[PDB]
Amino acid sequence: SDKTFLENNQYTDEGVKVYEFIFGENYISSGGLEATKKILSDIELNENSKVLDIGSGLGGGCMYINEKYGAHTHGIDICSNIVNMANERVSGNNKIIFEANDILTKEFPENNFDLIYSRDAILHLSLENKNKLFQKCYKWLKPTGTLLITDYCATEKENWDDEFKEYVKQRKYTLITVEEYADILTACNFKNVVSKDLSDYWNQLLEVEHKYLHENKEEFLKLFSEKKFISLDDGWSRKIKDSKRKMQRWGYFKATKN
Numbered sequence: 036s037d038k039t040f041l042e043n044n045q046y047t048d049e050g051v052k053v054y055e056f057i058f059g060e061n062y063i064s065s066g067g068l069e070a071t072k073k074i075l076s077d078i079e080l081n082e083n084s085k086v087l088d089i090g091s092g093l094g095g096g097c098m099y100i101n102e103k104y105g106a107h108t109h110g111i112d113i114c115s116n117i118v119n120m121a122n123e124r125v126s127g128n129n130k131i132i133f134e135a136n137d138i139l140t141k142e143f144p145e146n147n148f149d150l151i152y153s154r155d156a157i158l159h160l161s162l163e164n165k166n167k168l169f170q171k172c173y174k175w176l177k178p179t180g181t182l183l184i185t186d187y188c189a190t191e192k193e194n195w196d197d198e199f200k201e202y203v204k205q206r207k208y209t210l211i212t213v214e215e216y217a218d219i220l221t222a223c224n225f226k227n228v229v230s231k232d233l234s235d236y237w238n239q240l241l242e243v244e245h246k247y248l249h250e251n252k253e254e255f256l257k258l259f260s261e262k263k264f265i266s267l268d269d270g271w272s273r274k275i276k277d278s279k280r281k282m283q284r285w286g287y288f289k290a291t292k293n
């Protein structure tokens with residue numbers, strides 16, 4: 036349903052490959068590997084740690100976490116086709132698991148994870164479901180555990196222009212303000228809630244990706260089509276414009292159970 040809408044539109048096999056082209060190998064979100072190194076730079080884990088990755092995509096985040104720390108990583112993603120692709124990217128590693136499932140219906144034991152991690156996935160959930168998810172994350176975290184999130188956010192809806200409204204509507208995103216997001220975490224009883232508006236950094240990542248796209252247009256055209264190139268090009272152009280004026284925002288959130 037939600038699954039079908041995602042698999043048949045934004046995340047068809049080709050759509051995913053187009054994203055991987057611009058974001059980088061094994062990634063379908065902002066800044067690919069380099070942004071991941073920075074997001075995890077102050078996170079401490081080891082070979083005994085258990086990590087959940089919500090919306091694991093092609094699995095680059097789980098791969099990086101397992102490589103850097105030796106941690107057990109479990110990725111959940113609702114799109115079966117994406118999970119099938121993820122499974123082809125990893126072999127012979129019994130500490131990386133990818134599972135096709137809606138995170139909203141997945142069950143895990145209480146006090147299970149040292150880190151719950153999610154990069155640009157929760158924007159797909161309705162506001163009601165964001166709240167439900169974070170209650171679940173709260174239960175699933177170990178007492179000593181950490182929640183680490185980046186997600187698409189936005190200025191107040193009253194401020195949105197026609198083009199942005201249409202962007203959000205077509206993708207069926209639910210974009211709230213960085214402040215509202217932080218309030219949800221606080222309402223779910225997370226402690227030490229830190230929220231950062233990383234829109235300027237996001238804007239930097241977009242500009243690099245955009246330049247890469249232009250410089251590799253010939254290769255892109257061979258792999259895909261000019262029509263897909265124009266759509267992607269225009270799409271990044273708008274994100275660059277809208278992040279610059281803070282209409283579309285990139286939020287970072289870190290919190291703890293205790």
Ligand SMILES: C[S@@+](CC[C@H](N)C(=O)[O-])C[C@H]1O[C@@H](n2cnc3c(N)ncnc32)[C@H](O)[C@@H]1O
Nearest residue numbers: 063064090092112113114137138154155156159
């Ligand atoms: C930004 S893309 C993948 C991001 C991935 N974390 C990365 O950085 O490469 C967002 C992902 O969230 C997944 N997703 C959306 N709703 C979901 C849900 N309810 N449960 C699990 N995954 C979901 C989508 O299938 C998609 O793969």
